[PDB]
Design a protein around this ligand. Sequence first.
Ligand code: NA
Ligand code: NA
Ligand code: NA
Ligand code: NA
Lengths: 389, 389, 389, 389
Amino acid sequence: AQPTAVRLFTSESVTEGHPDKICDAISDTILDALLEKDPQSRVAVETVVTTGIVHVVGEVRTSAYVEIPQLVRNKLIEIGFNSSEVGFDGRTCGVSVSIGEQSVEEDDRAGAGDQGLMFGYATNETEEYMPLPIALAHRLSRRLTQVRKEGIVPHLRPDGKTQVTFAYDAQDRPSHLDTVVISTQHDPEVDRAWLETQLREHVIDWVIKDAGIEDLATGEITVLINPSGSFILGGPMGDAGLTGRKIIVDTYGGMARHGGGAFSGKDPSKVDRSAAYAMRWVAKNIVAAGLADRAEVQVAYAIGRAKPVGLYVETFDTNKEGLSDEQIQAAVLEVFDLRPAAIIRELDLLRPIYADTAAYGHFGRTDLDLPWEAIDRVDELRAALKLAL
Amino acid sequence: AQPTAVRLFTSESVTEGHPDKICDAISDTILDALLEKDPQSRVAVETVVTTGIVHVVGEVRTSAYVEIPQLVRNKLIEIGFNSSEVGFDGRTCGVSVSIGEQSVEEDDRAGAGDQGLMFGYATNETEEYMPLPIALAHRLSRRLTQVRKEGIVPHLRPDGKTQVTFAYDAQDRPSHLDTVVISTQHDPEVDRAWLETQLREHVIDWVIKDAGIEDLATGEITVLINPSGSFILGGPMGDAGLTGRKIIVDTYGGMARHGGGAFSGKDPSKVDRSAAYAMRWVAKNIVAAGLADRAEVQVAYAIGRAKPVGLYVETFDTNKEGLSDEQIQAAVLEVFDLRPAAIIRELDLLRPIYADTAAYGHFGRTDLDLPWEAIDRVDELRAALKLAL
Amino acid sequence: AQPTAVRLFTSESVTEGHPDKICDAISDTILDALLEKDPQSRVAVETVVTTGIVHVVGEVRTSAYVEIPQLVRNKLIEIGFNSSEVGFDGRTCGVSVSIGEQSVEEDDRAGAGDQGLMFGYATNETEEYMPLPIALAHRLSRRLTQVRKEGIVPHLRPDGKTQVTFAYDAQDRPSHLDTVVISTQHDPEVDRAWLETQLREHVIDWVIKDAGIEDLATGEITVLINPSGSFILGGPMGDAGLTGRKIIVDTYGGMARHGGGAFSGKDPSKVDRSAAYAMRWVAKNIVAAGLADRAEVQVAYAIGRAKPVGLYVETFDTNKEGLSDEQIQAAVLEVFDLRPAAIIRELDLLRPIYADTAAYGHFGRTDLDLPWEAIDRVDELRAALKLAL
Amino acid sequence: AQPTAVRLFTSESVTEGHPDKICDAISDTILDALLEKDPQSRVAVETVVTTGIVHVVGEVRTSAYVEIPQLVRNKLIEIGFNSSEVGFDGRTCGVSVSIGEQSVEEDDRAGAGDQGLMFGYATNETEEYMPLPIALAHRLSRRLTQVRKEGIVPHLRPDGKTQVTFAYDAQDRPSHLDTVVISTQHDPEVDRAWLETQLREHVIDWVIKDAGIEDLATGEITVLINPSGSFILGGPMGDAGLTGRKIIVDTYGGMARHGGGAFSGKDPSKVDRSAAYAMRWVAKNIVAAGLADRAEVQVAYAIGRAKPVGLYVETFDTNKEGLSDEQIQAAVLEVFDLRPAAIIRELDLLRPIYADTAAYGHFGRTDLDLPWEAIDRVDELRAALKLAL
Ligand code: NA
Ligand code: NA
Ligand code: NA
Ligand code: NA
């Protein structure tokens, strides 16, 4: 009868050298430097980059002493922006700071510092409990940076972007890898032709095997490398960057819903970051407890109130043990303390662990030890639901 | 058996006086001023505000001559930031500009200027085809600004935020208004007690009737006004703002998925904005054609390619006429040209219509005449699907 | 025969509220804050102000920890810029910092850090060894600020300027006060008419008596107060300010020659400041030793060399004891060690004494205890010249 | 009897690549670009440079449309700052603009826009009527830039400084060249040893002959080239620059007195620039009319008044024709209209001639055709004094 089209779902990542990620990384490098000397630091630090300029703005309350300019310059050199020839130089660029520095009992009862909504998500489709499209995109962006830093593929520059499109079935499940896009900055000594062969072998094919998805990468797949052509100049020049402009890359690649809150530059007292981490923790435990294959949980808060005004559990009809999302939600309310101060305490968030989160995703990081990734509430959830352990 | 909790879903809005929205508004005021003199202007303008400072950065290619500083200062005075006493003054604040100005046949075949994914959404639960929680939040933020500008409620200041939590049923449908939060900046002559009575009557109750949701606002509802207490100082001072930091408020309040792209400061050549508008157009027409009650469509693009690499139609089991989402998607591919240049042409996007979008939502605006809100593809969709008109 | 005109010589001062002096004061407040915690601080700090903005730039090498933004804001409130109504507000203005913090035996032999020339001057026409025109202008600017801060004259604002013109004789000597100009910022509650009566009595007439110049202020003198009319808005708005843009007001009002070097923002290792202070010390001692009535000494230096490349003593034919300027210069070379490290040691310059110098003149300050004002080399100079003590 | 020392007088110049001169040049490039399209442009433009940053601030009232960022970048490339390797790059540096653009009969009677004093000077010791020390320093700085741009001496970079010390007699007259200092930025391929031979021959010796001062350059002269050693990195990085920080280099090298006013960035309506130019015109005509060998004239003004409040002619006992400085001054008052609008009209100042003045001196420029250098009032002065023509 009426023709059917194949539904194609896409997620993207970027390198640490994409201007938005430079900002997220600088914001979180400042936050770590402050939490290292004063774990109680309140931090709302935003970064903006444009041609030859890094502008850091916002508010800090801290007892720590940190040199922000040297932190900025060293982070840019670590990413690889070390020359006017590459379009940006940590050693010779402008750095400007406009930050204002001034003007368990009660602890767990402190109000949210702001209103807002935050979402968390988990799926058993990958070992890291992450949607396949975003996971593959992050692996590709990380591998692109690795081949450059380890010299596996030479003549590469820091700025880069990755995009993965997967065909899906009528049940909303991933079926086949359809299209992979990789755009990387490079030296004038190399061209798209050289990059096409180098990246398809050392980045795309290597990641397909490293991720064990060969079964989804069989057949015909479109590979586009530098489809726009030469990419010699990259970074802030001709592409302004700002902190909190890659919130979907930082989370689940669009597979999960988002509340709009950015994470980088914010200390754990900001529900925009802490509550999103708590929701990832809750969702992962819900799936790890065998209550569902996929779970998305929204939490919401009123300024000056510790208890959430909202909570919303969705398992997309993958609910198990004959339990409804309403029943799973009641078990979440019994097991998890979602007051801001309780989240900081239970996840031990007052440590300099954030700069690592500021590129390649906050969630499903096999390479990091992040507390919101712990499946340490499975027994509590099944017990609360009167299920066998 | 195991206890059930009520699922509670939340969406928020902000006034034009919230620092992030000041940035979005200034970005889009610059874009309109350029499109008014040169409809072909290429515009990537980002705004950052902090204490006493407005910093505009990015790239313009235009034949137009516009005075950016006066555009900034006049827009701040229009929002109401006109005094150090209010925390920010359009007449005496810093304004800095770091913008680089330099360095139908083929038309419809031009490549996307970037890769990326964009989502569009529509629901028949409201006349404006918008999710109820975000629609109520936008109505509250708009009414809060209106009562101040028209003097219905005196002693109010520009900065404000609104949040609405709705109880939902097991079928993922809104059932009852549960909690409304309103936080507004104000003069020292008034306090939370005075605001509680004034806002609950002139803003919350007025909006409930104006929106015809009295049937969902019966019973017990929690109303919180300035729950954190006094809000005399607002705007950029002590709360830095950046363009593209309210993308969920700009779209569907978290009910729909998002690709991460910000809209303000970008000319229609940027798929981050144009493709999101096209997806709203497609989704609204899908629901207006009676093919579904709710529809979310993702579109994706590779840099240097005109045809999308991806498209993904989801109607959440509300599909009608015995049609699958695969069949609806094939009809969307027959009816809609989703090449960037085709979207600009069919929606007539090369006009100064964007500043109005930069607060109170880009979608479901009864007060504006926006081309992506037109249900002018219903006949084409039903025809393509061989349905009666 | 051919007609004679009366030669009229002019010098000016400004209040601490003039935008250039705001910059000098902020630069020297930062320098003092650093010298207070680390007397070895190397400091090259420049300040720029414009509408709503304070931008601090340059280089520091220090072990000290100081909060520059709070130092800026507190200094602006001390001057009186505390409202958008006054045109500038220390509490709500932008503050941006772009300062790089990184990348006796030998001591007295260290090279000059730069080349350059510096002049010093002294005259016995006043008790403070200062030219009469600049001394009167400084007294007027200080009195204008005092009447405002002590409330002697109400409704005054911080920004102000003073100018004094004196008639001179054919021997280049001051003969009579001819014209006094005072321009002050003010509240809208007062006008030029009210200021004319208030300032002429509480500022001009009071200073004439306080300085004991009634004998030069007899007869007809032109007094102009706010000759341009209203001065409600002042400070950086509509009048950008920069450090080192009032070098003549900082020195001798144009009576003496200048080498071009600014003083504020520079630690004592900078010959631009230290050598100018040494030349004031030498000139004052030359006149205090009875070797001349007026003396101007230029000193010059090559980068990487401790000994001056030049020295130039001029007494304008006021030389005494039958000694030439060549003979006085030889005695200066016997008495004074003018190597940069020797100047720092002999004048004890490594102390937070500079913020006080940053308005109302570096020289002839009766209200301060500055080491370059000490006449403690008179005995040494007369001895070296084989004169009676 | 008491020993005599030789009095040694010093003046300095800098290249167009010294950071202060970069600012003066950018300020005056903006002013020319505006005067070229709108000769009535009111312009108060200040430039600040530091590592990787160019910040332009102030006020413009104009009908002209100019692209300030491209003017900045092109001027930096013209000076030679075109690489991170050289320490600064016009193509990749930050450029920020904070300029406010808003908020014959009567003509000749307009008030001075500000109070202030300004000095002019002329001497017959050189053909250009300039003091020998500053003239030689300017010739050396210009030659240093020329050898680099024409490739006479390779491996040179833009930043450089020159200093000349001359021995003087007891009559205050130059007697012999004593010390010449040249410090130039350079490539790592060359060292001080190579520069010592190249600059002493192609710059110092060439200038001595080009200026015809071989008679003052006989005997023993100290030549110091890069006495501090290597100078690979120069420009704004590690040496902040500001407009109006080289006012002595711009005028007479300290031989003449100064009122403190900077010239660059100011349109001819600013007496700080116009009145200083008028005083150079008056002084040069006084000496060219045979009334003196050396002449210095100070002029002063009250805000809102067209007629000077002061004028002061000094010829240092070099007065001729048995005329006093009082008599010469009366003749100056008969011959010259020194109202601001009269100076603009008589010197035809409303033209884009200022960028050329912004390095290598405003006065005695043989290479430019500047109206304040015209000796076209000699006949009028001698006539007024009843002398033979
Ligand atoms: Na579905
Ligand atoms: Na559901
Ligand atoms: Na004289
Ligand atoms: Na003399």
